[PDB]
Every structure is written in structure tokens, then in C-alpha cells.
């Protein structure tokens, strides 16, 4: 790959923003705050694609705890996470899950 | 501390089984099947490889939240410590488990 | 190319790497890694295989007892053998292997 | 809290310094190229490894590093290294203990 795959756990800093590509593919962006314990927080901008993007826009909001795995990138400088998988954390919440 | 931390993504093979220790700490166990896939260029199709199975255990509040939220067949993402134990075999000591939103939505409720 | 379980393991070689070749003549080196948590705890043992140039570099550079860091893909193979014995092996398909500098130095020569 | 693995080449020779207590600490910058844009991370390793690094590694060399991803100050992302290895992808190594 040359890709840097990582996992991050934290809380959304903001509600997800849903956009679309020219082909009509959904893309949702949101910032995650990961806090080591409180030490200084790691903030990462995440983007989620396709169906997951819509499930995220609908299901998630500021303050919710997530676990995300994706590919770490740097843009020209901001560091970003291209998310491959996103889950609503069950650490301190329950979920009623509905298959799309 | 020299622990081997890994992230696994897949479907629950069975309903989580919830038990308690003598001190009263909740513990939920369940098996995750993670299926790799490769694109077959000649047939123009994604073909599935052999599934990776791991027995997971989650502790305390998370354990009860799992017993309440997850069922057989649901997709999850888990991060935790890879262990093998007594013959030896593998097990994941879960530090964090999430219900995947890849192809589902969720109503989330704190605590 | 999808749904793979990528992991990093750190530990010592249990044995000298075993160098073999595929029918096409590609090198492949197998070695088992022993990862021991300090929390000494029970060690995690994982069979690794590395390919091509790295495999040769490994056979040449590493031996039993040396400390490595490896990143690769965790796979499961389950089968019934010619004698009716049902078995399963887990294996780390290595993408990157490094000689650890935690308690060693190294003279590094590019191939 | 956020442990990651990164693979790449040293942008520069490692810089060895010491703290008031005499603890060694080595800093180097890794470039990880997916060619697309490169991910650049400043790495620091402590103690014996810091010294082994200063003696073993130089700019251009390929490494694999595992450690804790941190952010500071605008801001920059740093890797607090728990483990660093000289990659054998396109190199051989003569390895010596301690």
C-alpha cells in the first residue's frame, strides 16, 4: 500500500457534514477528538464514503463516541483520516441497530 | 506494555453471552468472523477469501451494552489485545467495540 | 485487497528463518515470533511469512533470538488433512519487517 | 492512547540530545509515501534505543516505527516511539545486541 492504516477512538467535535461527489457518491466529514487520560487531545478530520456516509450523517452527532479505522493522510498542512470503517461505540451507550 | 493491540471488523457468529465474575463484573463473549475479499479481474467480481474467526470478550458496562445492543449476524468493529491461552488458542480482550454503520443506522442512547 | 486484518507484532524469533521458494522462484521466509507482554506475561506466538527480496534479506540478517517489528495481514487457514484431522493455523502475512533497535545496533546496507 | 505504525524513510540524520536527568532522546522525521503526497511525522525515541538509533540510522534509510500519535501547539503531529526497526525490505543488516 504505502498506506498508513490506523484506528482512532473518540468523540465527534461537530455534527457530520454530508456532501456529494459529481458521480453522486455521498461523503461525510466530521472531526474526532481523542483524549488520552485528561491530557492534550488529538483532533482528526475524518471523511466517510458512500452508504456509510449517509448512515453516519443520520446516526451520529456532536459528542457521540466512535471507533474509526482508516488511512492517515496529510494535505497541502492538515492531517486527515480516510475512513474505511466506522462504529458507534458501546463503551457508555446502547444502540438499536437497523440494517439498511 | 508489550501488548499486541489489533482492530478486527466482521459479523457476530452468535448472540453475545453475558456472565458475571464473583466480584460482579459483567463479561460478554462472542465470536467475530472477518471475511477478506479480493477483486477477480477476469470475472469482474469481488471474491471472498477464508474467514478469520476470533473469540472476543468485553468487560463491565460495555459488556452489558453489548448484550443489549448486538445480535448474531450484526457487523462490528473491535479494538483490543490479542491473546492466546490454555494447548493454546487465540482470543481478543476487547478495549472498545462499536456497532458498524457500514450498512446500518443506529439509535444511540448514553449510559 | 479488502477486509484484511492488518496488525503489528513486536517480539523475538523463536527459530532461525526458514528460506524456501515458490514454483515461480520467488523467495519466502518463515519464522515464528514470540511477543511477551510485561504486565513477563503469557507470550503470543505467531508464524510469519515474508516474500521476495525481504525474504532473502531476512534469511541473511536475522536469526533465533533477535528482536523484530513486523507489520502484516492476519489470516486463518482451516482444513481437514489427509488423515482426517481437522485443523486450523493462523498466520501473519508480512508486509514489512524490521530489526528492532530497542536493545541492539545495526550496520545497515542497502541492496 | 492512539498507537500507530508508520513505515518510511528518514528525511534527515537523527538528532541526539539529553534531558536534565541525562536521559537520551533521539529525534528524526519520517516520510511515508503512499506516488501520492507524503505523510511527514516527527519521531522521538528515548533511552538506549535513542542511542542505538543515533548509531544505526541515517537519512534515506527505511524504518518501521510504532508509537503514540500526539498533537501539539499552529499545530504539528508527533510520534512518541515505543519501537523502531531498520526495515529489511531493500536492505540487509548486521545486528549486534545491547
JSON list of C-alpha atoms in Angstrom, two decimals, chain D residues 14-65:
[
{"chain": "D", "resi": 14, "resn": "UNK", "atom": "CA", "xyz": [18.66, 11.56, 13.78]},
{"chain": "D", "resi": 15, "resn": "UNK", "atom": "CA", "xyz": [19.40, 14.32, 16.30]},
{"chain": "D", "resi": 16, "resn": "UNK", "atom": "CA", "xyz": [20.51, 13.07, 19.71]},
{"chain": "D", "resi": 17, "resn": "UNK", "atom": "CA", "xyz": [20.02, 15.26, 22.78]},
{"chain": "D", "resi": 18, "resn": "UNK", "atom": "CA", "xyz": [19.69, 14.74, 26.52]},
{"chain": "D", "resi": 19, "resn": "UNK", "atom": "CA", "xyz": [17.36, 15.87, 29.28]},
{"chain": "D", "resi": 20, "resn": "UNK", "atom": "CA", "xyz": [18.49, 17.47, 32.59]},
{"chain": "D", "resi": 21, "resn": "UNK", "atom": "CA", "xyz": [18.37, 14.00, 34.16]},
{"chain": "D", "resi": 22, "resn": "UNK", "atom": "CA", "xyz": [20.69, 12.63, 31.49]},
{"chain": "D", "resi": 23, "resn": "UNK", "atom": "CA", "xyz": [18.06, 10.61, 29.57]},
{"chain": "D", "resi": 24, "resn": "UNK", "atom": "CA", "xyz": [18.88, 10.22, 25.88]},
{"chain": "D", "resi": 25, "resn": "UNK", "atom": "CA", "xyz": [16.27, 11.27, 23.28]},
{"chain": "D", "resi": 26, "resn": "UNK", "atom": "CA", "xyz": [16.64, 11.00, 19.51]},
{"chain": "D", "resi": 27, "resn": "UNK", "atom": "CA", "xyz": [14.52, 12.92, 17.02]},
{"chain": "D", "resi": 28, "resn": "UNK", "atom": "CA", "xyz": [14.10, 12.19, 13.35]},
{"chain": "D", "resi": 29, "resn": "UNK", "atom": "CA", "xyz": [11.48, 12.88, 10.70]},
{"chain": "D", "resi": 30, "resn": "UNK", "atom": "CA", "xyz": [9.94, 10.04, 8.72]},
{"chain": "D", "resi": 31, "resn": "UNK", "atom": "CA", "xyz": [8.48, 10.44, 5.23]},
{"chain": "D", "resi": 32, "resn": "UNK", "atom": "CA", "xyz": [5.83, 7.86, 4.36]},
{"chain": "D", "resi": 33, "resn": "UNK", "atom": "CA", "xyz": [4.88, 7.85, 0.68]},
{"chain": "D", "resi": 34, "resn": "UNK", "atom": "CA", "xyz": [1.65, 6.09, -0.38]},
{"chain": "D", "resi": 35, "resn": "UNK", "atom": "CA", "xyz": [3.48, 8.43, -5.72]},
{"chain": "D", "resi": 36, "resn": "UNK", "atom": "CA", "xyz": [0.96, 10.49, -3.78]},
{"chain": "D", "resi": 37, "resn": "UNK", "atom": "CA", "xyz": [1.54, 13.15, -1.15]},
{"chain": "D", "resi": 38, "resn": "UNK", "atom": "CA", "xyz": [3.91, 12.10, 1.63]},
{"chain": "D", "resi": 39, "resn": "UNK", "atom": "CA", "xyz": [2.91, 11.79, 5.25]},
{"chain": "D", "resi": 40, "resn": "UNK", "atom": "CA", "xyz": [5.60, 13.51, 7.35]},
{"chain": "D", "resi": 41, "resn": "UNK", "atom": "CA", "xyz": [5.95, 12.71, 11.06]},
{"chain": "D", "resi": 42, "resn": "UNK", "atom": "CA", "xyz": [8.48, 13.89, 13.63]},
{"chain": "D", "resi": 43, "resn": "UNK", "atom": "CA", "xyz": [9.57, 10.93, 15.73]},
{"chain": "D", "resi": 44, "resn": "UNK", "atom": "CA", "xyz": [11.28, 10.82, 19.11]},
{"chain": "D", "resi": 45, "resn": "UNK", "atom": "CA", "xyz": [12.73, 7.74, 20.77]},
{"chain": "D", "resi": 46, "resn": "UNK", "atom": "CA", "xyz": [14.07, 7.59, 24.34]},
{"chain": "D", "resi": 47, "resn": "UNK", "atom": "CA", "xyz": [16.80, 5.82, 26.30]},
{"chain": "D", "resi": 48, "resn": "UNK", "atom": "CA", "xyz": [19.02, 3.07, 24.95]},
{"chain": "D", "resi": 49, "resn": "UNK", "atom": "CA", "xyz": [17.05, 2.97, 21.68]},
{"chain": "D", "resi": 50, "resn": "UNK", "atom": "CA", "xyz": [17.71, 6.69, 21.19]},
{"chain": "D", "resi": 51, "resn": "UNK", "atom": "CA", "xyz": [21.43, 5.90, 21.23]},
{"chain": "D", "resi": 52, "resn": "UNK", "atom": "CA", "xyz": [21.13, 2.77, 19.08]},
{"chain": "D", "resi": 53, "resn": "UNK", "atom": "CA", "xyz": [19.19, 4.94, 16.62]},
{"chain": "D", "resi": 54, "resn": "UNK", "atom": "CA", "xyz": [21.87, 7.66, 16.55]},
{"chain": "D", "resi": 55, "resn": "UNK", "atom": "CA", "xyz": [24.47, 4.97, 15.88]},
{"chain": "D", "resi": 56, "resn": "UNK", "atom": "CA", "xyz": [22.49, 2.89, 13.35]},
{"chain": "D", "resi": 57, "resn": "UNK", "atom": "CA", "xyz": [20.28, 5.17, 11.26]},
{"chain": "D", "resi": 58, "resn": "UNK", "atom": "CA", "xyz": [20.90, 7.97, 8.78]},
{"chain": "D", "resi": 59, "resn": "UNK", "atom": "CA", "xyz": [18.78, 9.99, 6.37]},
{"chain": "D", "resi": 60, "resn": "UNK", "atom": "CA", "xyz": [17.40, 7.96, 3.48]},
{"chain": "D", "resi": 61, "resn": "UNK", "atom": "CA", "xyz": [17.19, 4.75, 5.50]},
{"chain": "D", "resi": 62, "resn": "UNK", "atom": "CA", "xyz": [13.88, 2.88, 5.62]},
{"chain": "D", "resi": 63, "resn": "UNK", "atom": "CA", "xyz": [12.29, 2.26, 9.01]},
{"chain": "D", "resi": 64, "resn": "UNK", "atom": "CA", "xyz": [9.20, 0.84, 10.64]},
{"chain": "D", "resi": 65, "resn": "UNK", "atom": "CA", "xyz": [8.08, 2.66, 13.78]}
]
